[PDB]
């Protein structure tokens, strides 16, 4: 009993010391420094394409490396691969279980993964010798439901399941290589680094941690949110990331200085945040709110600069393309739209 | 027109893909999807086993009856938070519920002051009054009745429910439990609760499920054309 008590008080003392060390390094906020710059007036974006054809809710989408192709997953059991320019479809990959919550597109354009509620990440092949698409691998090592998965490489994929863990897989062998543990709540968001060396995960209890894929250990942890985390995206520089939430608040953290920098909250929004993504130069922080419209929150000014209100139901996924030419938002009304 | 030779062929592929999507979209839209819920020892296995079968994580069960295709989703292996994956079941015809009558004198595991019947009542109150399941009816099943008879013939019901004036007979105790489960329904003008007592006859339960689904379909059709 006494050992547990001394361990708890030592942990509390270490947490307090970390808090004082984090407070001592704070001298000026981001708003005071970025006060002598010219802010953007208005960001008016008009829809260009309306990719229609789905027959149920849309839960995730990912842009290809060529900035031309995108894959979208829906509840009816389809994994259509659209063409952004001419609106045509390229594939109509069916699914085993019609309960999907994530999808990814390989950086080489060969494979496409799609997890879901069956806690199984299915990897499909698009460049087969035949004319159809086959299931190259079927990874099954998670207990809780799968939330999001991104391709670390053409042979390695990292997944974030609902059983408070994240794991790195090996498509060739079929078994996981490294298992990342430490989260207390459900992990439901992650994003890879530009150099593909580290990644962060967004838990379901007001927490975000930074992992390294080589050592498989927790380097830093970030707190400050109230309800939970719901979406994360890195800064194009690679030393910052923005975390959505459910209490109408998305904040910007920093890696070198493990401290919150700026929060984007408004008194008119009282609804959650489903998706967060940066821009090509890290100036516009698009956020997808579940009140049927998105936002174009500025990064260095913490003010709204536009509203993409052209949707019917809650938006659940959106991502800026690689070359920064257009954005795509997919909502629960089975309609994707390409803004520019 | 402005399209090249092989570009016109790529457009024809998109039309065939869309036609194949629309063909399969009209096949999965004519089958009844209904979710199955319950407690740990609520006898969901016996309920899903006594019915006819045609077919780790979600388990789907397919069966047909009177030219209708039913789908049974058994989300029992999901140990994660129910609040996160409950919005994908928004479009559903009914919600089967399983509760055990004989499970009222047996307390929870690793516990002594919490009763499992109260836990089942709390779960039903949380499911029926959820913000997503505001229009979907609920089919309620009382699994065990003979064991409940043998348990209540010797043990009084006042152990679980401290308010009870009737005798220690099953005829009124079943009605009391049913009425207690009916009162946990705030949305009294948008959904109904069909109660049935599970019997040894396998055909009767499937017939009751079919009747409830048909009544829900009739009500939805009446609400569709603005006639009700």
């Amino acid at each position: 009993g006494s050992e547990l008590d001394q361990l708890r008080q030592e942990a509390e003392q270490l947490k307090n010391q970390i808090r004082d060390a984090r407070k001592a390094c704070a001298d000026a906020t981001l708003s005071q420094i970025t006060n002598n710059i010219d802010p953007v007036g208005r960001i008016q974006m008009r829809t260009r394409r309306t990719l229609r054809g789905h027959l149920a809710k849309i839960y995730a989408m990912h842009w290809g490396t060529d900035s031309r192709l995108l894959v979208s997953a829906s509840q009816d059991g389809k994994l259509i691969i659209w063409d952004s320019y001419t609106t045509n479809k390229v594939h109509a990959i069916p699914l085993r279980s019609s309960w999907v919550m994530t999808c990814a597109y390989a950086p080489s354009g060969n494979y496409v993964a799609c997890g879901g509620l069956d806690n199984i990440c299915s990897i499909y092949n698009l460049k087969t010798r035949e004319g159809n698409v086959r299931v190259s691998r079927e990874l099954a090592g998670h207990t809780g439901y799968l939330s999001c998965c991104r391709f670390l490489d053409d042979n390695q994929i990292v997944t974030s399941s609902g059983d408070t863990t994240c794991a790195l897989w090996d498509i060739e062998t079929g078994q996981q290589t490294t298992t990342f543990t430490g989260h207390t709540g459900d992990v439901m968001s992650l994003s890879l680094a530009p150099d593909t060396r580290l990644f962060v995960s967004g838990a379901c209890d007001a927490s975000a941690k930074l992992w390294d894929v080589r050592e498989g250990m927790c380097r830093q942890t970030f707190t400050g949110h109230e309800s939970d985390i719901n979406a994360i995206c890195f800064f194009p520089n690679g030393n910052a990331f923005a975390t959505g939430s459910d209490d109408a608040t998305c904040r910007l953290f920093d890696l070198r200085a493990d401290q919150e920098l700026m929060t984007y909250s408004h008194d008119n929004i009282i609804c959650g945040i489903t998706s967060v993504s940066f821009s090509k130069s890290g100036r516009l922080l698009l956020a997808g709110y579940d009140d049927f419209n998105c936002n174009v929150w500025d990064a260095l000014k913490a003010d709204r600069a536009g509203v993409l209100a052209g949707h019917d139901n809650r938006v659940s996924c959106l991502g800026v393309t690689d070359d920064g030419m257009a954005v795509a938002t997919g909502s629960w009304d089975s309609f994707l739209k390409i803004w520019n | 027109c402005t399209l090249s030779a092989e570009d016109k062929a790529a457009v024809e592929r998109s039309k065939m893909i869309d036609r194949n999507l629309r063909e399969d979209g009209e096949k999965a839209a004519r089958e009844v999807k209904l979710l199955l819920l319950g407690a740990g020892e609520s006898g969901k296995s016996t309920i899903v086993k006594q019915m006819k079968i045609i077919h780790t994580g979600i388990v789907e069960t397919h069966f047909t009856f009177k030219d209708l295709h039913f789908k049974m989703f058994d989300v029992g292996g999901q140990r994660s938070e129910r609040k996160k994956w409950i919005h994908c079941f928004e479009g559903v015809t009914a919600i089967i519920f399983c509760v055990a009558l004989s499970d009222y004198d047996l307390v929870l595991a690793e516990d002594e002051e919490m009763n499992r019947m109260h836990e089942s009542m709390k779960l039903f109150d949380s499911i029926c009054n959820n913000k997503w399941f505001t229009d979907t009816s609920i089919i309620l099943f009382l699994n065990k009745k003979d064991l409940f008879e043998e348990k209540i013939k010797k043990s009084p019901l006042t152990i679980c429910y401290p308010e009870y004036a009737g005798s220690n007979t099953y005829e009124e105790a079943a009605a009391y439990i049913q009425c207690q489960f009916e009162d946990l329904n705030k949305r009294k003008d948008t959904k109904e609760i069909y109660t049935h007592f599970t019997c040894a006859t396998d055909t009767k339960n499937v017939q009751f499920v079919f009747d409830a689904v048909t009544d829900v379909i009739i009500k939805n059709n009446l609400k569709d054309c603005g006639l009700f």
Partner: single-chain antibody, 232 residues
Framework: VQLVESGGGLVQPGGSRKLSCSAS????????MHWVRQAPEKGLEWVAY????????YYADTVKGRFTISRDDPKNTLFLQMTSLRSEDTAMYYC??????????????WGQGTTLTVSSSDIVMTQATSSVPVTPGESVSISCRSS???????????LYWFLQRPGQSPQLLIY???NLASGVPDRFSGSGSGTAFTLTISRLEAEDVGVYYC?????????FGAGTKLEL
């Protein structure tokens, strides 16, 4: 993947048999099929084409309204019927598949082909030369000139290139400008400007020798070249 053909022999002018081929090893229900006739010791030309699902069917201007063609999805068999015969129809027929979507490589696999003997505006593609002697291990450039700018408003050309091996069916090398097909070595390379096109080979061995053919695809009346032969 395998494509075998049957229904050829010695026939009299006026009536003939039916040319049928069987497909086995891929999804035949989602591939557009072509037909390429190769005259004896001469050049090869296009005959007909069927879209996926028999949606659009077209023929060549020489045999327009004289041939009958159709698909069969259940048994994966392609049929071609002759109505009237001439003294020039004696040639070797080939049945080649093709699929058209963003990033696809049409007619990557040709097949084997069958023989047939008979007892008795459009874009013009021309080759630079006919036959040139070459030593092993020497970089050769084969040029094919077009009569029309094949560069489309999209940004990609439609000049396909394939090598004919003596004794079997040809195989594709590059499909639009330089993108090598799956299975060909890295020695082959392609380049062009829109009217004049060239193909450069880095290392020349004894395993890659034959006749080179250049084909356009912008205008729908497909036309091939005369053929450049390589002599060892």
């Amino acid at each position: 993947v395998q494509l075998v053909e049957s229904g050829g022999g010695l026939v009299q002018p006026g009536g003939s048999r039916k040319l049928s081929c069987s497909a086995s090893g891929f999804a035949f229900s989602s591939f557009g099929m072509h037909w390429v006739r190769q005259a004896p010791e001469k050049g090869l030309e296009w005959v007909a084409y069927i879209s996926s699902g028999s949606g659009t069917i077209y023929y060549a201007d020489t045999v327009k309204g004289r041939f009958t063609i159709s698909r069969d999805d259940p048994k994966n068999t392609l049929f071609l019927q002759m109505t009237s015969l001439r003294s020039e129809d004696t040639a070797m027929y080939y049945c080649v598949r093709s699929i058209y979507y963003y990033g696809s490589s049409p007619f990557d696999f040709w097949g084997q082909g069958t023989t047939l003997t008979v007892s008795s505006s459009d874009i013009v593609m021309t080759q630079a030369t006919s036959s040139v002697p070459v030593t092993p291990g020497e970089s050769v450039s084969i040029s094919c000139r077009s009569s029309k700018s094949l560069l489309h408003s999209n940004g990609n050309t439609y000049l396909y290139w394939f090598l004919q091996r003596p004794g079997q069916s040809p195989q594709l090398l590059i499909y639009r400008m330089s993108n090598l097909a799956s299975g060909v070595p890295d020695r082959f390379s392609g380049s062009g400007s829109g009217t004049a096109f060239t193909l450069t080979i880095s290392r020349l061995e004894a395993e890659d020798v034959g006749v080179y053919y250049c084909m356009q695809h912008l205008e729908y009346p497909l036309t091939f070249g005369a053929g450049t032969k390589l002599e060892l």
